[PDB]
Design an enzyme around this catalytic site. Structure first.
Site, PDB file in Angstrom:
ATOM      1  N   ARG A   1       0.820  -1.204   0.000  1.00 39.16           N
ATOM      2  CA  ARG A   1       0.000   0.000   0.000  1.00 39.16           C
ATOM      3  C   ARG A   1       0.859   1.261   0.000  1.00 39.16           C
ATOM      4  O   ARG A   1       1.883   1.331   0.682  1.00 39.16           O
ATOM      5  CB  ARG A   1      -0.934   0.015   1.212  1.00 39.16           C
ATOM      6  CG  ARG A   1      -2.182  -0.836   1.057  1.00 39.16           C
ATOM      7  CD  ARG A   1      -2.924  -0.962   2.377  1.00 39.16           C
ATOM      8  NE  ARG A   1      -2.104  -1.632   3.381  1.00 39.16           N
ATOM      9  CZ  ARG A   1      -2.505  -1.912   4.619  1.00 39.16           C
ATOM     10  NH1 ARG A   1      -3.724  -1.570   5.020  1.00 39.16           N
ATOM     11  NH2 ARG A   1      -1.682  -2.530   5.460  1.00 39.16           N
TER      12      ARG A   1
ATOM     13  N   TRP B   1      -2.993   9.437  11.073  1.00 37.56           N
ATOM     14  CA  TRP B   1      -3.168   8.665  12.289  1.00 37.56           C
ATOM     15  C   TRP B   1      -2.370   9.280  13.432  1.00 37.56           C
ATOM     16  O   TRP B   1      -2.868   9.390  14.552  1.00 37.56           O
ATOM     17  CB  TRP B   1      -2.746   7.207  12.074  1.00 37.56           C
ATOM     18  CG  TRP B   1      -3.620   6.221  12.770  1.00 37.56           C
ATOM     19  CD1 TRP B   1      -3.368   5.590  13.963  1.00 37.56           C
ATOM     20  CD2 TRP B   1      -4.890   5.739  12.323  1.00 37.56           C
ATOM     21  NE1 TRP B   1      -4.403   4.747  14.278  1.00 37.56           N
ATOM     22  CE2 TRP B   1      -5.352   4.818  13.289  1.00 37.56           C
ATOM     23  CE3 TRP B   1      -5.689   6.003  11.205  1.00 37.56           C
ATOM     24  CZ2 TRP B   1      -6.577   4.157  13.168  1.00 37.56           C
ATOM     25  CZ3 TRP B   1      -6.899   5.344  11.082  1.00 37.56           C
ATOM     26  CH2 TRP B   1      -7.333   4.430  12.059  1.00 37.56           C
TER      27      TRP B   1
ATOM     28  N   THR C   1      -2.032  -8.131  16.734  1.00 31.37           N
ATOM     29  CA  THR C   1      -2.020  -7.866  15.298  1.00 31.37           C
ATOM     30  C   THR C   1      -2.864  -6.636  14.920  1.00 31.37           C
ATOM     31  O   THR C   1      -2.935  -6.283  13.741  1.00 31.37           O
ATOM     32  CB  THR C   1      -2.510  -9.086  14.479  1.00 31.37           C
ATOM     33  OG1 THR C   1      -3.853  -9.407  14.847  1.00 31.37           O
ATOM     34  CG2 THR C   1      -1.605 -10.323  14.709  1.00 31.37           C
ATOM     35  N   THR C   2      -3.490  -5.984  15.906  1.00 32.81           N
ATOM     36  CA  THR C   2      -4.115  -4.665  15.666  1.00 32.81           C
ATOM     37  C   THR C   2      -3.066  -3.591  15.386  1.00 32.81           C
ATOM     38  O   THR C   2      -3.392  -2.516  14.873  1.00 32.81           O
ATOM     39  CB  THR C   2      -4.954  -4.157  16.885  1.00 32.81           C
ATOM     40  OG1 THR C   2      -4.085  -3.976  18.016  1.00 32.81           O
ATOM     41  CG2 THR C   2      -6.082  -5.124  17.258  1.00 32.81           C
ATOM     42  N   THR C   3      -1.822  -3.905  15.760  1.00 27.46           N
ATOM     43  CA  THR C   3      -0.649  -3.011  15.794  1.00 27.46           C
ATOM     44  C   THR C   3      -0.656  -2.070  17.003  1.00 27.46           C
ATOM     45  O   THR C   3       0.303  -1.332  17.219  1.00 27.46           O
ATOM     46  CB  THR C   3      -0.497  -2.139  14.517  1.00 27.46           C
ATOM     47  OG1 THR C   3      -1.494  -1.103  14.516  1.00 27.46           O
ATOM     48  CG2 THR C   3      -0.615  -2.987  13.260  1.00 27.46           C
TER      49      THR C   3
ATOM     50  N   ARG D   1      -9.573  -4.068  17.887  1.00 25.46           N
ATOM     51  CA  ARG D   1      -9.779  -5.455  17.421  1.00 25.46           C
ATOM     52  C   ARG D   1     -11.229  -5.738  17.025  1.00 25.46           C
ATOM     53  O   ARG D   1     -11.487  -6.235  15.933  1.00 25.46           O
ATOM     54  CB  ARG D   1      -9.339  -6.454  18.495  1.00 25.46           C
ATOM     55  CG  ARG D   1      -9.494  -7.942  18.099  1.00 25.46           C
ATOM     56  CD  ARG D   1      -8.407  -8.374  17.133  1.00 25.46           C
ATOM     57  NE  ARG D   1      -8.759  -8.101  15.751  1.00 25.46           N
ATOM     58  CZ  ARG D   1      -7.879  -7.864  14.787  1.00 25.46           C
ATOM     59  NH1 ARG D   1      -6.573  -7.866  15.037  1.00 25.46           N
ATOM     60  NH2 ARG D   1      -8.308  -7.644  13.559  1.00 25.46           N
TER      61      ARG D   1
ATOM     62  N   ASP E   1     -12.496  -3.529  14.037  1.00 25.05           N
ATOM     63  CA  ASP E   1     -11.926  -4.063  12.806  1.00 25.05           C
ATOM     64  C   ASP E   1     -12.630  -5.357  12.409  1.00 25.05           C
ATOM     65  O   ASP E   1     -12.971  -5.549  11.246  1.00 25.05           O
ATOM     66  CB  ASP E   1     -10.425  -4.299  12.956  1.00 25.05           C
ATOM     67  CG  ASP E   1      -9.771  -4.713  11.652  1.00 25.05           C
ATOM     68  OD1 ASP E   1     -10.045  -4.067  10.616  1.00 25.05           O
ATOM     69  OD2 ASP E   1      -8.992  -5.687  11.658  1.00 25.05           O
TER      70      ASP E   1
ATOM     71  N   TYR F   1     -13.916   3.881  11.441  1.00 23.63           N
ATOM     72  CA  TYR F   1     -14.883   2.850  11.083  1.00 23.63           C
ATOM     73  C   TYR F   1     -16.293   3.236  11.498  1.00 23.63           C
ATOM     74  O   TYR F   1     -17.118   2.375  11.810  1.00 23.63           O
ATOM     75  CB  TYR F   1     -14.501   1.519  11.720  1.00 23.63           C
ATOM     76  CG  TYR F   1     -13.245   0.884  11.157  1.00 23.63           C
ATOM     77  CD1 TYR F   1     -11.985   1.374  11.477  1.00 23.63           C
ATOM     78  CD2 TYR F   1     -13.323  -0.222  10.321  1.00 23.63           C
ATOM     79  CE1 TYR F   1     -10.840   0.784  10.961  1.00 23.63           C
ATOM     80  CE2 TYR F   1     -12.182  -0.819   9.809  1.00 23.63           C
ATOM     81  CZ  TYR F   1     -10.942  -0.313  10.133  1.00 23.63           C
ATOM     82  OH  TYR F   1      -9.805  -0.904   9.624  1.00 23.63           O
TER      83      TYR F   1
ATOM     84  N   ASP G   1     -15.750  -0.441   6.704  1.00 22.41           N
ATOM     85  CA  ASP G   1     -14.345   0.006   6.688  1.00 22.41           C
ATOM     86  C   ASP G   1     -13.831   1.004   5.611  1.00 22.41           C
ATOM     87  O   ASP G   1     -12.709   0.830   5.140  1.00 22.41           O
ATOM     88  CB  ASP G   1     -13.445  -1.241   6.614  1.00 22.41           C
ATOM     89  CG  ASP G   1     -13.688  -2.072   5.358  1.00 22.41           C
ATOM     90  OD1 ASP G   1     -14.861  -2.390   5.061  1.00 22.41           O
ATOM     91  OD2 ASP G   1     -12.702  -2.404   4.666  1.00 22.41           O
TER      92      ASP G   1
ATOM     93  N   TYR H   1     -16.929   1.796   3.272  1.00 22.41           N
ATOM     94  CA  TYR H   1     -16.185   0.543   3.125  1.00 22.41           C
ATOM     95  C   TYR H   1     -14.884   0.825   2.365  1.00 22.41           C
ATOM     96  O   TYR H   1     -14.455   1.978   2.283  1.00 22.41           O
ATOM     97  CB  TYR H   1     -17.017  -0.516   2.381  1.00 22.41           C
ATOM     98  CG  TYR H   1     -18.338  -0.899   3.030  1.00 22.41           C
ATOM     99  CD1 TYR H   1     -19.335   0.047   3.247  1.00 22.41           C
ATOM    100  CD2 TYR H   1     -18.601  -2.214   3.389  1.00 22.41           C
ATOM    101  CE1 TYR H   1     -20.541  -0.298   3.828  1.00 22.41           C
ATOM    102  CE2 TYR H   1     -19.808  -2.571   3.962  1.00 22.41           C
ATOM    103  CZ  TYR H   1     -20.771  -1.609   4.183  1.00 22.41           C
ATOM    104  OH  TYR H   1     -21.971  -1.957   4.759  1.00 22.41           O
TER     105      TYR H   1
HETATM  106  C1  LIG Z   1      -4.031   1.658  11.975  1.00 25.61           C
HETATM  107  C2  LIG Z   1      -3.006   1.365  11.150  1.00 25.61           C
HETATM  108  C3  LIG Z   1      -1.763   0.712  11.707  1.00 25.61           C
HETATM  109  C4  LIG Z   1      -2.962   1.956   9.722  1.00 25.61           C
HETATM  110  C5  LIG Z   1      -3.193   3.476   9.618  1.00 25.61           C
HETATM  111  C6  LIG Z   1      -3.554   3.751   8.174  1.00 25.61           C
HETATM  112  C7  LIG Z   1      -4.134   2.467   7.612  1.00 25.61           C
HETATM  113  C8  LIG Z   1      -3.989   1.416   8.702  1.00 25.61           C
HETATM  114  C9  LIG Z   1      -5.465   3.017   7.131  1.00 25.61           C
HETATM  115  C10 LIG Z   1      -6.586   3.242   8.121  1.00 25.61           C
HETATM  116  C11 LIG Z   1      -5.661   3.312   5.829  1.00 25.61           C
HETATM  117  C12 LIG Z   1      -4.548   3.083   4.831  1.00 25.61           C
HETATM  118  C13 LIG Z   1      -4.111   1.685   5.225  1.00 25.61           C
HETATM  119  C14 LIG Z   1      -3.396   1.646   6.559  1.00 25.61           C
HETATM  120  C15 LIG Z   1      -1.988   2.169   6.351  1.00 25.61           C
HETATM  121 MG   LIG Z   2     -10.066  -8.202  10.522  1.00 26.04          MG
END
Ligand SMILES: C=C(C)[C@@H]1CC[C@@]2(C1)C(C)=CCC[C@H]2C
Ligand SMILES: [Mg+2]
Ligand SMILES: [Mg+2]
Length: 536
Positions: A252, A261, A389-391, A429, A432, A508, A513, A515
């Site tokens: 990505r 974020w 794995t949510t980070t 979690r 998501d 969300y 998501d 979507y």
């Molecule tokens: C919460 C996360 C660790 C990341 C923050 C941005 C993220 C997920 C989103 C929401 C959109 C682009 C995809 C991806 C990079």
């Molecule tokens: Mg999931």
């Protein structure tokens, strides 16, 4: 041995953030006027003879205007006095506002203040239904309740139903504020985006607005935005120089969304370095996720996982070329962290984020194994792996790297997975999983959260999703409780965790998501926070 398909879309932003040159003359102009306005505002706060209601409305307005970070000591001193004195206001509006502001700042004001507003059966007097300001403030307050606040157990429903009924006949901007509240409560919103909405959509249009506060709010927001734009430019160049969009074409290209974020996690000037450090981890972990989710083979993923545990550039020969690229980058990033923290003498705390990186990679590999085996774990086992794995353990830990105040003791506390962190992770979690279920269900995921839940408890998709919503509700009360004094660490180190829970709820919102690449949800907020200034 084939791979998936180039399914992701490019960055819709192009190069519009790549270079930003600050008009230093304009920034200095803003800074100079803000300084004057800051002092006028300080004098408003320190004015004697103010009534409770007026004092709370001033604090509330300054917080909503996004400028309270200028007055942390003053505001704390005032709320502390209000807490300690016997406040006997008999109006729903003032009581509910007093409750909210005190609780949000960690003061454990008793919810008994709401009893006078309820019948003998502990239900809110329906006769309150014609008091829109009371309803609105009760509404906002209801989102800050803990497990000990069951007197408020129906406040949300009560205020919601009557605000809905009253909204269309209200004057502007009260109508827009109420309608916005019903879509997005203040306590669970991202502070910069609620601030942006309040300034432009509400306070700018309020007949009674304080001109000094409004001008202050606008200038401060736009000046901060300049800093954010400089940061995003710096980060965009860093990302571009890595050139992953070329060498790792499966990944990505979302550094703008990653930066947004960090802006949700903290927006203040003092956290500039912190945001720049944080965004780089968010970008890199999304690379790792994608490597696990749609490119690496089982065998490749196992070597990747092992190399991460060993964490030595020596290990890079044991990897395929395409994994060599992210692996070196990961190791370089943490060596970079160590170098920029060495002048402050804080290099030694980088290891804590490194341990969380090692952790999430292990759990990614477990998730892959589960998927390959077609394993559907019980919810307890599922969560034991899927929380990481949510980070969010990694991000929370990383958020501290650039905070000058963060100490070893602060990292040790975080390392034990304290309740407030666990709560935030759980929220991420289950939100998501609720949003991801239907799409991932068709993608072959047998080990998706909702599926595990459906199978464990022998319940339907709806019942499972309601169980997950209940977990999130429980976690929000835990977060709220975790903000109450005395806090186990300084509140400076709790707010990132709270803010992490806020962004995921916002990202969300209204399902799912939301979507297709949460970008569509994020796009307007990115425009409002990072492209368009507030017109003055
Ligand atoms: C919460 C996360 C660790 C990341 C923050 C941005 C993220 C997920 C989103 C929401 C959109 C682009 C995809 C991806 C990079
Ligand atoms: Mg999931
Ligand atoms: Mg994944």
């Amino acid at each position: 041995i084939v791979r998936p398909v180039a399914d992701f879309s490019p960055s819709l932003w192009g190069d519009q953030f790549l270079s930003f040159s600050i008009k230093n003359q304009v920034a200095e102009k803003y800074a100079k006027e803000i300084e004057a306005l800051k002092e006028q505002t300080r004098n408003m706060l320190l004015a004697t003879g103010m009534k409770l209601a007026d004092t709370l409305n001033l604090i509330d307005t300054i917080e909503r205007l996004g400028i309270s970070y200028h007055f942390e000591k003053e505001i704390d001193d005032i709320l502390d006095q209000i807490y300690n004195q016997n406040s006997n206001c008999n109006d729903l509006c003032t009581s509910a506002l007093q409750f909210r502001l005190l609780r949000q700042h960690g003061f454990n004001i008793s919810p008994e203040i709401f009893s006078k507003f309820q019948d003998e059966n502990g239900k809110f007097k329906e006769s309150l239904a014609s008091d829109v300001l009371g309803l609105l403030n009760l509404y906002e307050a209801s989102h800050v309740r803990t497990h000990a606040d069951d007197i408020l157990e129906d406040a949300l429903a009560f205020s919601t139903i009557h605000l809905e009924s009253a909204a269309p006949h209200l004057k502007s901007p009260l109508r827009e504020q109420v309608t916005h509240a019903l879509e997005q409560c203040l306590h669970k919103g991202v502070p910069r985006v609620e601030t942006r909405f309040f300034i432009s959509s509400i306070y700018d249009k309020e007949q009674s607005k304080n001109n000094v506060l409004l001008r202050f709010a606008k200038l401060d927001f736009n000046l901060l935005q300049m800093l954010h734009k400089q940061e995003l430019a710096q980060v965009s160049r860093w990302w571009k120089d890595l050139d992953f969009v070329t060498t790792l074409p499966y990944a990505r290209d979302r550094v703008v969304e990653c930066y947004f974020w960090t802006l949700g996690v903290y927006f203040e000037p003092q956290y500039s370095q912190a945001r720049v450090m944080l965004v780089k981890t968010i970008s890199m972990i999304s690379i790792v996720d994608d490597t696990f989710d749609a490119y690496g083979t089982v065998k490749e993923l196992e070597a990747y996982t092992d190399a991460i545990q060993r964490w030595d550039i020596n290990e890079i020969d044991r990897l395929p070329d395409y994994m060599k690229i992210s692996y070196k980058a990961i190791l370089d990033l943490y060596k970079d962290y160590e170098k920029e923290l060495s002048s402050a003498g804080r290099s030694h705390i980088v290891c804590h984020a490194i341990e969380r990186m090692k952790e999430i990679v292990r759990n990614y590999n477990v998730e892959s194994t589960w998927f390959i085996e077609g394993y559907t774990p019980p919810v307890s086992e599922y969560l034991s792996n899927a929380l990481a794995t949510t980070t969010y353990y990694l991000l929370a830990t990383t958020s501290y790297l650039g905070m000058k105040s963060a100490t070893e003791q602060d990292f040790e506390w975080l390392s034990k997975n304290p309740k407030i962190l666990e709560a935030s992770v759980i929220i991420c979690r289950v939100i998501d999983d609720t949003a991801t279920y239907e799409v991932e269900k068709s993608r072959g995921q047998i080990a998706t959260g909702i599926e595990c839940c459906m199978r464990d408890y022998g319940i339907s998709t709806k019942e499972a999703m309601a169980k997950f919503q209940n977990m999130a509700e429980t976690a929000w009360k835990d977060i709220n409780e975790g903000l109450l004094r005395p806090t186990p660490v300084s509140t400076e180190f709790l707010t990132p965790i709270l803010n992490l829970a806020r962004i995921i709820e916002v990202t969300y919102i209204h399902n799912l998501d939301g979507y297709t690449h949460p970008e569509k949800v994020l796009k307007p907020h990115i425009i409002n926070l990072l492209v368009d200034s507030i017109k003055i």
